[PDB]
Design a binder for this molecule. Structure first.
Ligand SMILES: OC[C@H]1O[C@H](O)[C@H](O)[C@@H](O)[C@H]1O
Ligand SMILES: OC[C@H]1O[C@H](O)[C@H](O)[C@@H](O)[C@H]1O
Lengths: 688, 688
């Protein structure tokens, strides 16, 4: 599927896009001149329109009014502001759900999901599909021929709320998905191990989705659950593809996207898979408060880039300050608004947008920050948004557009499907999920001055000097071979606990762990040692001999190969059986290359262990112990021009080596002759 | 009923049974010769088969095939391995629930319980009874005279998930049980105090089970709830009785059992009552991780013996290492495999089995340990299993079989009905339940080198030298006469807070606590003093004058009798009204015998207080301050042979006086001329 990036309005140059969700249909019409006036002053040059506007467009069944939308598009176009137009199909009107309550999502207990919030429709309902596909057709027909429209924003965050449906529509389509993937019922029975607890299937007609099995102390089929999660993603991908085929047929030159929600902990949609279906990848991401703020945002933006295969990507939403949807919504500290935007940009984005333009006075999102606060033009956030628009204009003129996130020395593998598998309630421990571990390695390498590339499992991590395999619970035979081949030919691999436990069907590998690849890794494990404080006197941590500490889970390593070296061992009470067992090992395999980390060390423990592990593998690290003070993010043009961003990672002002080049952008920082200065949350960009 | 013990295969001697749930229907057929081979090598002499095999026996309605099952039974019989055969009725096929969804269990809130796990049937559903009782006939008809079958494993773990059903079948059957228990509606009104909040019943037709009352802040009738729990247990007991009757009719000489879930915390089925319905008692028990590991398993096994009235019993399931069903599933430490089995064996088991033979690759229980792990015969678990089989063969040859768990000096009373009663949500505090107290008493006497016998309340505790009455919340007049008579004639009693609060209908006794027994105990209490940290500045503990601390709840002892002595008082801020009040008293009554403990002490508090209490009661305790280091469990033959087992209770290697006689078994232990050595988790057995 070819990359096609939204293009300028007629007579404008190519620029970093900079905008917001705009919702003028929630204000009186006469607010729009001020909006536009402030958007111009802020250097805003695109808005996303009509995302949730279904009910103000098809105002009653069969009745489509476009006037208010055409008027504001006109006003925006005359001002030089492009329009990312939504399909308007995110959330249906009251008249549609009143009249057809059968579009309503059902939860795992059979609860109806009422109107009164959003995205409360069943992804596989035919009635709902027909309405959507009609609105799509009407929107497209009305706006082909309209030159303000530069891209389609199809739907909105599919499966954010409606990922899991259990309606009879879902019952039916999950069967058909099973028939299509498995052909014959006996193939389904093998994939799921239905000979456990009299679950054996006679026919496809017998397959149900994992509805309520009584809650706690009751365990649903794990392979079925995996496939169900797969199916839920596919069902909405299918729905999205249909909406987009309809818009594209009528407006073939108009590039189409939908907004992803890629973040460290996202555990529903398989975005890498959806990525084959969009003309350019776009993402919505909101900061994690506290210490994780910087590293988890960088990690995420890197993964977007990975999912993107290094094509430029579109930041469709983030917050200027507080969000509204956590138990506690911290505000952003000074400089974090410009800094976070620059982090997404540094990680390859060529568009930077917010939810949303103007703060609502009312509705569930009234407390969600915006580009123009209820406090108005004379506010810190608006001033900062203006400074940010100028910075992006400056970076547009410096020629940053279309440069790629340069290729890191290390790839960190991310794998939603391994994440699904690790969510079963009957694993060795609920305290391990796949998603935390790749983030831990990303931060630890950053701590040692290394910017890793986060890559989905199907991307080309096997072309990097090095790869991290973190809790990659699912290993197929083709994955085994890819990994084997990689290390054979000179690859360095860091491989952790919880990797290669099962095949792609969640069928646990036999004869010892890691499954399939024990030859490459040169380690053998018969069982896990989970850790915690569930009951008094439980073994709750395991010290490691280099001064670190494992929590949640260690591997019990039974034996290692003759040419495996032990870098570190566990230190425990002798009654545990863990004392003196191998905790960190290194093992050659032809021209590589394999380190094994036999429990959860956390960002800090990985970081402590990195020098020793890398030395033994041949992977070179900056000797500077200031290495972790700053995150260094580099985009490259094919023509040779290099853009390097620096971010302070820490809670004090730091000083660092000035890179070569022209200083382009600076927030809470200072350029000098030898040394660059960065305040907390400061950032610099250089071209060289 | 008559004790019948499963008998050897033709031409075999009697041996301790040693085996597992075996699940050949989950594996390809050609795997069996390997199973049988490794079984022989491990000394396994029995397996339990077809427990969840409905779907592969009645493969469609009325269609019964037995081929695969006769095949494996033949391989096993050839290899000298007996079969404990299931009714196969534990969990119905997908075709049966497809066609008759009215079998599905209904929860407290009316949700359907779907297939996809197990035991999702209504205990009183007449349709499901029909199906089950036919499958029973077919199994019995097909296997009568087949000499490999040495026992029936009827259903599985009744009430493990389906204990509480709220379907119309349960509605209708609860009325019937009430009509049969009370005769007239006025007696129902009397037992449950329905004149509170306009609940008085006009007829049995108005009797409903305790469905949802709106949750938090709403409180269901506690007398009704009590009887409802009794009913849920009787309703499943009856189902079992019917299944079993259909089986012993066809096969009058094959002894039958069903697997109980006796453990310190279980709080559903009344196992002592069900024990009347089996030919021999069998139990599934899984370790508590941490400090509680040893004491809670010995407690539970002791209770099985008590429930068994000291007849030999059958450990039907336990884990070689980790289970799969806690949020954190720790593995067993080295030696705990053999030690735990020896603990069950020491407490009176003549048969030791695991769930399960071979670790599943798939299904909800794939992470549950087995005798033969995924990692294969080359694994520590399988090696330890082999050692254990040799050990149980050794003990077989020593003549342990049918030795009885010796009579302790103190019985500790357990009482499922009191447990039920203490579960209501409007008691003085939710941090008091009956079940923790007898366990605390077991562990404490053990710390003072006394192995108590845990006895259900209807067993003969009134024939021990001492009894512990721990939170026996329900006290009928007959129970009070039993305790009075026991103490009159020279008994020694330890009686705690939360005893004799209410009659057998949960109707609180009047005129002061403990009710009925105030004369025997010598203490009068008007109200409780609950303790905890729910609001700032709440009274959260009360120190006691012998240096212990009470938590969660204390009595307010208002007055003691003329001849009651105070051994210890509460110490507290004077404003509490608790400072100087009686905390532990002792009171003679004719030739006995009564100590009263007015609050929750913990294992440590009881342990610290035992010497002063036992000295004052005249109960002799070992003078050795090392007494708590090892747990001594003792089985006896009529011919006077004696099997003494010794277990290290502690987390350090311990040393102790060598027992007289022949060393039989050692694990993580060591023999010597004067002293015996036990490592943490060690065990030794001797015969004399
Ligand atoms: O932070 C809240 C924000 O989240 C995403 O960006 C949605 O697509 C927005 O419309 C809004 O709900
Ligand atoms: O610990 C899990 C295990 O527990 C009990 O023994 C059940 O009867 C088994 O069938 C199995 O589910």
């Amino acid at each position: 599927r070819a990359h096609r990036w939204p293009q300028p309005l007629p007579g404008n140059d190519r620029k970093i896009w900079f905008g917001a969700d705009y919702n003028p249909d929630q204000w009186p019409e006469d607010v729009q001149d001020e909006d536009i006036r402030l958007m111009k002053q802020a250097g805003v040059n695109i808005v996303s329109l009509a995302i949730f506007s279904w009910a103000n467009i098809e105002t009653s069944d069969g009745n489509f009014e476009f006037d208010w939308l055409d008027r504001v598009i006109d006003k925006l176009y005359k001002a030089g502001i492009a329009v990312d137009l939504a399909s308007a199909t995110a959330s249906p009107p009251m008249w549609l759900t009143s009249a057809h309550p059968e579009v309503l999502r059902r939860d795992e207990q059979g609860h109806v999901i009422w109107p009164g919030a959003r995205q409360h429709w069943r992804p596989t309902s035919p009635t709902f599909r027909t309405y959507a596909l009609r609105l799509c057709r009407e929107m497209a027909e009305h706006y082909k021929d309209n030159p303000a429209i530069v891209s389609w924003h199809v739907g909105n965050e599919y499966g954010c709320h409606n990922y899991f449906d259990y309606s009879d529509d879902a019952v039916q389509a999950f069967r058909e998905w099973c028939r299509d993937r498995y052909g014959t019922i006996d193939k389904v029975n093998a994939a799921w191990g239905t000979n456990f607890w009299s679950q054996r299937l006679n026919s496809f007609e017998e397959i149900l989705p994992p509805r309520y099995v009584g809650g706690e102390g009751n365990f649903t089929n794990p392979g079925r659950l995996l496939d169900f999660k797969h199916f839920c993603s596919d069902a909405l991908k299918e729905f999205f593809c249909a909406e987009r085929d309809v818009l594209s047929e009528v407006t073939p030159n108009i590039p189409l996207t939908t907004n992803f929600m890629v973040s460290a902990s996202q555990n529903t949609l398989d975005y890498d898979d959806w990525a084959h279906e969009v003309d350019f990848v776009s993402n919505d991401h909101y900061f994690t408060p506290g210490s994780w703020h910087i590293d988890e945002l960088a990690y995420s933006a890197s993964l977007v880039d990975g999912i993107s295969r290094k094509k430029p990507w579109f930041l469709m939403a983030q917050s200027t300050s507080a969000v509204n949807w956590r138990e506690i919504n911290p505000r952003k500290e000074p400089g974090e608004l410009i800094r976070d935007s620059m982090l997404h940009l540094a990680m390859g984005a060529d568009a930077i947008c917010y939810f949303q333009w103007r703060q609502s006075r009312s509705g569930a999102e009234k407390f969600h920050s915006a580009m123009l606060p209820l406090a108005g033009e004379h506010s810190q956030i608006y001033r900062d948004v203006c400074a940010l628009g100028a910075d992006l204009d400056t970076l547009s003129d410096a020629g940053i557009l279309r440069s790629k996130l340069s290729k890191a020395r290390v790839a960190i593998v991310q794998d939603i499907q391994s994440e699904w598998a690790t969510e079963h309630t009957a694993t060795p421990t609920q305290h391990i999920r796949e998603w935390t571990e790749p983030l831990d390695w990303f931060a630890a390498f950053a701590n040692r001055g290394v910017t890793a590339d986060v890559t989905p499992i199907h991307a080309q991590w096997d072309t990097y000097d090095a790869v991290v395999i973190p809790c990659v619970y699912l290993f197929s035979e083709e994955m085994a071979e890819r990994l084997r081949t990689f290390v054979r030919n000179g690859g360095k691999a860091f491989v952790t606990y919880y990797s290669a436990l099962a095949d792609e069907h969640d069928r646990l590998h036999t004869e010892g762990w890691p499954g399939l690849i024990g030859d490459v890794v040169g380690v053998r494990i018969e069982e896990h040692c989970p850790l915690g404080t569930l009951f008094p006197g439980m073994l709750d941590h395991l010290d490691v001999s280099n001064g670190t500490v494992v929590h949640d889970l260690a591997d019990v390593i039974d034996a290692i190969a003759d040419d495996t070296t032990v870098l570190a061992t566990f230190e425990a009470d002798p009654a545990t059986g863990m004392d003196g067992r191998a905790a960190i090992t290194v093992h050659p395999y032809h021209e590589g290359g394999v380190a094994y980390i036999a429990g959860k060390l956390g960002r800090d423990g990985i970081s402590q262990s990195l020098p020793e592990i890398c030395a033994a593998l041949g992977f070179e690290l900056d000797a500077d112990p200031r290495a972790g003070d700053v995150l260094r993010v580099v985009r490259e043009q094919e023509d040779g021009a290099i853009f390097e961003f620096l971010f302070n990672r820490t809670r004090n002002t730091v000083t660092a080596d000035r890179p070569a080049g022209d200083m382009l952008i600076c927030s809470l920082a200072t350029d000098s002759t030898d040394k660059v200065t960065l305040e907390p949350n400061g950032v610099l960009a250089f071209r060289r």
